[PDB]
Amino acid sequence: VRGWSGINTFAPATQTKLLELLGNLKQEDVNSLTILVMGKGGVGKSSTVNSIIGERVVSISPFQSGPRPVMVSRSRAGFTLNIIDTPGLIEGGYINDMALNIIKSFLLDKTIDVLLYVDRLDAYRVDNLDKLVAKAITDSFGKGIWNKAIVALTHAQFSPPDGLPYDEFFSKRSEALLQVVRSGASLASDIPVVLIENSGRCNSDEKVLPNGIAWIPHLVQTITEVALNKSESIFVDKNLIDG
Amino acid sequence: ASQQQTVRGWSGINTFAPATQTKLLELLGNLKQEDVNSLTILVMGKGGVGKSSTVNSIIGERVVSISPFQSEGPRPVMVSRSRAGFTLNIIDTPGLIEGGYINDMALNIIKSFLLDKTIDVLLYVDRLDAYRVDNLDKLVAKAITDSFGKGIWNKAIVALTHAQFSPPDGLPYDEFFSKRSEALLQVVRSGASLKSDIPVVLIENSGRCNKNDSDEKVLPNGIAWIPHLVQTITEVALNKSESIFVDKNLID
Numbered sequence: 001v002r003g004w005s006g007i008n009t010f011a012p013a014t015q016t017k018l019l020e021l022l023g024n025l026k027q028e029d030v031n032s033l034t035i036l037v038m039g040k041g042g043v044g045k046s047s048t049v050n051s052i053i054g055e056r057v058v059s060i061s062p063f064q065s066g067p068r069p070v071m072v073s074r075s076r077a078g079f080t081l082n083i084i085d086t087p088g089l090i091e092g093g094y095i096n097d098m099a100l101n102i103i104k105s106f107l108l109d110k111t112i113d114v115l116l117y118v119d120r121l122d123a124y125r126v127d128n129l130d131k132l133v134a135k136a137i138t139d140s141f142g143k144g145i146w147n148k149a150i151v152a153l154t155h156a157q158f159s160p161p162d163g164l165p166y167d168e169f170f171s172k173r174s175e176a177l178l179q180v181v182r183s184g185a186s187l188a189s190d191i192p193v194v195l196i197e198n199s200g201r202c203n204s205d206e207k208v209l210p211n212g213i214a215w216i217p218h219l220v221q222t223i224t225e226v227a228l229n230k231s232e233s234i235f236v237d238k239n240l241i242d243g
Numbered sequence: 244a245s246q247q248q249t250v251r252g253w254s255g256i257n258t259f260a261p262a263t264q265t266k267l268l269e270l271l272g273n274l275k276q277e278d279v280n281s282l283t284i285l286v287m288g289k290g291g292v293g294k295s296s297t298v299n300s301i302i303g304e305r306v307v308s309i310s311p312f313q314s315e316g317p318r319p320v321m322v323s324r325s326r327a328g329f330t331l332n333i334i335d336t337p338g339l340i341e342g343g344y345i346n347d348m349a350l351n352i353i354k355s356f357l358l359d360k361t362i363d364v365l366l367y368v369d370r371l372d373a374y375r376v377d378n379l380d381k382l383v384a385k386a387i388t389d390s391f392g393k394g395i396w397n398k399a400i401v402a403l404t405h406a407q408f409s410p411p412d413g414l415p416y417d418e419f420f421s422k423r424s425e426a427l428l429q430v431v432r433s434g435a436s437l438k439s440d441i442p443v444v445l446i447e448n449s450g451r452c453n454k455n456d457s458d459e460k461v462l463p464n465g466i467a468w469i470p471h472l473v474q475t476i477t478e479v480a481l482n483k484s485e486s487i488f489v490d491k492n493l494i495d
């Protein structure tokens with residue numbers, strides 16, 4: 001709706017890729033695409049929204065949260081990107097029901113093309129709190145949503161602890177989390193994990209992770225692949241919420 | 244005449260940078276000097292914050308296990324060492340928070356395990372690079388107060404780990420440290436039902452920590468963290484509050 005000026009801030013190799021990635025969504029009569037960003041938080045939702053958009057579109061508090069949700073919309077090459085930032089779902093050791101019901105009621109009649117479930121890469125645990133969140137997502141929008149889901153781990157410019165190589169650490173935390181979201185949602189198929197450094201930078205031109213991958217292209221690429229799998233999208237009716 | 248005394252202690256110290264051992268040897272005299280012949284340090288916190296790593300750092304030996312994913316270990320380990328007449332005992336403990344809630348199995352064995360021991364210092368442990376503070380933290384403060392009294396906090400030191408941290412958005416290290424501290428002392432005090440000391444010290448347990456020219460581990464703020472810590476321990480050891488004795492009355 002407002003024009004995607006943010007891409008201009010990206011690297012030319014990233015600009016070229018996003019215009020090509022946006023190109024083959026256009027090629028498939030995919031013109032809009034709505035992404036819902038949900039999680040925990042203070043785990044980098046807003047920041048991720050901001051990195052995608054290419055500018056500071058959502059408030060990031062370094063110290064306490066909130067309950068906004070926002071959709072920001074940016075057109076380019078005839079394609080329109082809607083991202084929804086949303087409050088963290090957890091309060092103390094419980095879901096914040098008010099906050100969930102707001103997300104829901106703000107989504108009333110919108111269409112979730114891709115859900116971006118955000119957590120930190122550099123956490124050392126999973127537990128009922130992670131389970132509850134996957135539970136809340138599934139009860140709100142159905143188990144069908146997880147086929148249009150991607151898990152994004154932020155603080156990806158981590159170097160692990162006691163000499164654990166970067167991949168081992170990564171690989172163990174991906175399963176740790178994938179197992180427990182799969183549990184709370186009750187569930188294969190995919191379901192993709194991408195890495196994210198909102199840092200800002202970051203080490204072509206655009207900005208690689210400590211395993212070689214350029215993540216902004218990689219995330220929009222994963223967003224296109226999850227956007228084109230079928231699958232279908234999820235139309236958030238007044239129906240679905242009472243589930 | 245001469246005897247063959249037997250004693251525990253402390254090969255760990257020899258592994259510090261020289262400049263650091265010197266300070267530590269000095270502080271231990273400071274303690275002996277005021278007739279403080281042993282210290283028991285109780286180390287408590289949320290899980291996965293570096294309680295064990297810190298105990299390993301202070302003792303300067305892998306004596307307690309490390310857990311990058313996992314927990315695992317649900318019972319206290321005490322490590323005890325000596326030098327020149329002084330005995331250091333340090334109690335590592337399991338994270339008191341699990342899932343949403345306090346873990347009273349964890350908690351209860353901590354309590355049982357401390358009976359008849361005396362707590363000279365409480366090392367409340369947390370991460371520096373956490374952005375949020377909520378009731379889970381406050382539940383932890385409350386659980387400690389409940390278990391030991393508002394008096395334990397006169398022997399509290401709060402110790403934030405992963406100190407080698409470049410704060411986001413260019414916010415300067417000290418400014419971050421200060422807001423994190425302010426926010427956490429607030430919520431400890433709230434759950435603690437208090438209202439300093441409470442000193443806050445930073446910790447970076449990593450091998451790859453930066454070093455000053457004397458090969459001491461340094462914070463980005465320029466301070467040699469280990470001596471600084473041992474020194475805060477000493478000031479609290481020597482402040483004018485009572486150590487905490489663990490009766491049945493205290494823990495019930």
Ligand SMILES: Nc1nc2c(ncn2[C@@H]2O[C@H](COP(=O)(O)OP(=O)(O)NP(=O)(O)O)[C@@H](O)[C@H]2O)c(=O)[nH]1
Binds near residue numbers: 046048063196
């Ligand atoms: N180093 C680093 N810091 C990050 C990253 N993502 C977020 N942060 C930092 O973590 C803090 C929280 O980010 P934010 O986007 O507000 O997270 P949130 O999940 O939206 N918080 P809330 O849920 O309360 O709205 C900020 O200080 C931000 O800079 C990342 O990839 N790397």
Ligand SMILES: Nc1nc2c(ncn2[C@@H]2O[C@H](COP(=O)(O)OP(=O)(O)NP(=O)(O)O)[C@@H](O)[C@H]2O)c(=O)[nH]1
Binds near residue numbers: 124
């Ligand atoms: N970079 C860095 N990692 C640290 C630091 N302290 C601890 N860690 C890492 O954080 C993880 C947790 O350490 P650990 O000592 O088990 O924490 P804990 O508080 O004892 N956890 P638990 O409650 O399970 O016993 C380990 O991977 C360890 O390597 C620190 O100062 N810096």
Ligand SMILES: [Mg+2]
Binds near residue numbers: 065
């Ligand atoms: Mg946010």
Ligand SMILES: [Mg+2]
Binds near residue numbers: 293294296308310337
């Ligand atoms: Mg431990």
